Design a binder for this molecule. Structure first.
Ligand code: HEM
Ligand SMILES: [C-]#N
Length: 212
């Protein structure tokens, strides 16, 4: 079974639980305000910063290299733009770093530094999502908060180097299937992907609580 198919099958159940989390359920209904949105994007800033720091550390490692797409996928630069937009010139000392966010970042550094063969699980979980539901969320955020078509405040959801997200995702899945794969690696990679989804669910459950 190709890795791409194994991952989709392994995470299809938790995805349902994730897309139906209270925070997302509300976001999807159009109920999202500046306060809540700033909280989630600030958290993503930390998460992608850690993820991409580990991707850079392992860019030459064969267990990840085929998926090294900085120009097309990396979001840190975009998030820094969004942070300046929502938090101002000195966003660095203004943005929050929640416990659930720190927990996610901790696992990212553990994987990148000690279990690099599992890093693919984390890139898959975040990036393929950004190119899927993330695109639907972007439209909802624009409408709800009156954000301009010019893109300010939503740089994170914008991929100027990807003309067709559908085509790129297919390309990415195909590349994932070129990775050296063994029962051991495939089993653990799908398990880490489920863990990645849980880290996201816990983040959203935390943020929802902070708001309420
Ligand atoms: C806001 C609620 C969500 C919506 C509306 C949503 C919707 C979708 C849709 C429509 C797809 C299918 C795209 C395709 O087949 O190419 C998809 C796939 C995916 N989503 Fe979500 N999603 C949501 C939440 C999440 C969350 C919280 C995560 C985890 C960070 C996530 C990660 C993924 C991944 C990794 C895929 C790709 C699965 C695969 O093709 O193997 N999604 N999502
Ligand atoms: C999917 N987001």
């Amino acid at each position: 079974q190709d890795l791409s198919e194994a991952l989709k099958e392994a995470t299809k159940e938790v995805h349902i639980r994730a897309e139906n989390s209270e925070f997302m359920r509300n976001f999807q209904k159009g109920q999202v305000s500046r306060e809540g949105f700033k909280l989630v994007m600030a958290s993503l800033y930390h998460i992608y910063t850690a993820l991409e720091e580990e991707i850079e550390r392992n860019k030459q490692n064969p267990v990840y290299a085929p998926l090294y797409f900085p120009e097309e996928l990396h979001r840190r630069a975009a998030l820094e733009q969004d942070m300046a937009f929502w938090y101002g010139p000195h966003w660095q000392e203004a943005i929050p770093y929640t416990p659930a966010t720190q927990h996610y970042v901790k696992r990212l550094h553990e994987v990148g530094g000690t279990h690099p063969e599992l890093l693919v699980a984390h890139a898959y979980t975040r990036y393929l999502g950004d190119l899927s539901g993330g695109q639907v969320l972007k439209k909802i955020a624009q409408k709800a908060m009156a954000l301009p078509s010019s893109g300010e405040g939503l740089a994170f959801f914008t991929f100027p180097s990807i003309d067709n997200p559908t085509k790129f995702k297919q390309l990415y899945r195909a590349r994932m299937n070129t990775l050296e794969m063994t029962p051991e690696v495939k089993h653990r990679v799908t398990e880490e992907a489920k863990t990645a989804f849980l880290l996201n669910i816990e983040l959203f459950e935390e943020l929802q609580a902070l708001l309420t």
